[model samples]
Target: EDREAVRREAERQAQAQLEKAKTKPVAFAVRTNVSYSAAHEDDVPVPGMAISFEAKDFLHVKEKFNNDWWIGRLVKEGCEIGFIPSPVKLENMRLQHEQRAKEFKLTPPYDVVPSMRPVVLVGPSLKGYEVTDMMQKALFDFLKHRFEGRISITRVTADISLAKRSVLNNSSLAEVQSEIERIFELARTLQLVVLDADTINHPAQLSKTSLAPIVVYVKISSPKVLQRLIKSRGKSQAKHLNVQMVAADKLAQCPPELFDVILDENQLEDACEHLADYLEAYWKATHPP
Candidate 1:
């Protein structure tokens, strides 16, 4: 009798949860374009626009838009999490980041204007070659135009030390684990964490339970990049970090219902429109009587 009662209660709860999920609003995905130009300093991409809507409500809206304008496949996975660039948070973080930059005698990664926390770029790499200085320069240029002196970017190598270890072969998992520990230690000190999607295979074994309040950037675009990364030993590291995967051409395709929020690749006009519609529908669905 006791077991039967428990089973009955479980079924009832499951049904309720299912109903709630169906009634919930669908999240809209947005994309912004980030480009690199020859005249690096002068070529900062503009923040185009942002859009939102619930999927269930705006499936029709998507059909109206020109799919050709977009790149990448449509996915309803990753959803947008909230932005942490609030004035207070920014102010506090800026002071800390500035101090660290000074301590390391590191020039602010971006031009010296006030802005949001820097966007950390994560990508896959082979052992022999690691993060090139060119990528760093491009990121700097991107931040310079948008945030001017306000934003600062920090470039981290996804596979830095591992590349150094190979005399005849690749670095072992033990070596990678050591490097992972070192990287997270640095991240905690810097108060920033950016994980490549490939890092999803292994869980992040940081000293803490939560990485809250600390900004985390997960790059899901570019399956090619991710595929290459997954092939690496770092995939184990990714799993531990709770890594999120996103399509490469975010602006071209709406992020599936699963994404926290879609990152606009370049903020193309069509991408913005689709996102806007998604947001509207998402809001309505959630608030319906």
Candidate 2:
């Protein structure tokens, strides 16, 4: 009968979802080190090699070159591999409410030692809409206007140089790192930092240089929802209007296991609240161990 057909179709639909979910790539492991503060330096070219990395970019460890360097490949292209200085040494806000624990996966026996503040890593929207900048300005502008005073954000965008003249190319890494330590110490009276995941390029890598940031990956479930985002967030920004279709296209990549939170682009309002709630839990947790 019709009822039997409806039941069968529902089961078929649910099974299809499970099948798609299983199609995702295998999970990757990341290594993080403890540091005293967040440093602002980018990668430097090694003297004898053709390889180099930009600032905050990390390598997948291949071998130990010496006590000071490790040979690893870059994030986007594995061929551009090189050495990165160990951050074995870098450096919160609070919220009210009886918060629930966030969905987290702790594996590979990593350490989540206590920090004086919190930093958030957000990025690479499913639709490639350049969403990280939207919130960067939202919070940046609010801070300039004297925000509710809970968190702070970085100004160095992925595409642009000079994090608001905050670049440190000329300064020695040692001095810049020391400066980072001092900057984090005196200025962090309240709130935290929101950095782009694309900016840092890797989740666990960021904790080594800057600070431990909870990663949030944004995605959409359907094409219709993508259209809805273009309409909602699209109305004000023209750039988003065109990412809808480039004259040509470039294929890229994906990862979900690294994300501490997966947010829906269509539900940004709710998404923003959930992030804020999670931040509250992070800032106030009695025991995150």
Candidate 3:
């Protein structure tokens, strides 16, 4: 009877604590690269960014989080976590560019790696540049319409050569700047943006002053490990494009100094735990509980 009484009292206290915890809201954001290889384990594909959040937290936010809002996961404990996946869907992005180019009666340049190709604007003067303006407006309108209620994730590639080219081609520098500024503003509103660091030549353009502060870099321990993982994933198309070489090139180019948190691919779970801990602390500091 004494043991039973103690057990019951302990259970009651635990339940009370859980109930109290449920009401205290905690929100935080995490940014990291979820590589094509990292998205899988033992030949099965998983949610690229979902690995970082607690299972319960992921489940809670999966439904409410928009396609662009891949970063947010709400837990039963009232913890809202956010994830950002770098180079969001290169294939889909290429398709989007192609469709937009076709709509503007322009042909995108063919390349061995179609996804890596820049959205180019050819010809002299503002004639071709006007089409660029139209395309930007259409894109902005479509995005705003698609993600009506809540802010969506903004995926930015570093290559803005076309925008720069447009500026040089005509007196549309102000127009180009305005459009770029608007897009940056949208990313700020969303509170999460995934940038393809490898593709960018000017890192300053995508600095925290323009975007958000929390920066994360995910890296494999060695090039050999990265090569092994990519080969195992067995994407035939990537193999043809020398995906391993491409990955190696990007890894070499990566400037480690930019990241606030550097995550090792080998220690995925531990890295996620540390990230969660930091996010929780950051949230608490900003939003006292």
Best TM-score among the predictions, by candidate number: 2
* Candidate 1 Cα outliers beyond 4 Å, as residue runs: 1-171, 194-261, 265-289
After aligning candidate 3 to the native by TM-score, how far in Å is the CA of 78 from where it should be? 22
Candidate number achieving the greatest lDDT relative to the actual structure: 2
| Model 3, TM vs. native | 0.34
* Model 2 CA lDDT for position 14: 40
Clashes of 1: 60
lDDT of 1 at 180: 46
Error of 2 at 205 (Å): 5.3
What does candidate 1's lDDT look like per residue over 140-224, in tens digits?
3543554343322343334333322242154355555554454434433222223322222111221111111111222335655
Candidate lDDT scores, in order, read: 0.30, 0.40, 0.36
Q: Which rank order by TM-score, best down to worst? A: 2, 3, 1
Question: In model 2, what lDDT does residue 61 have?
Answer: 43
RMSD of 1: 24.8
Q: After superposition on all CA atoms, what RMSD does each candidate show versus the true structure?
A: 24.8, 23.2, 22.7
Q: Over the full model, what C-alpha lDDT does candidate 1 score relative to the true structure?
A: 0.30
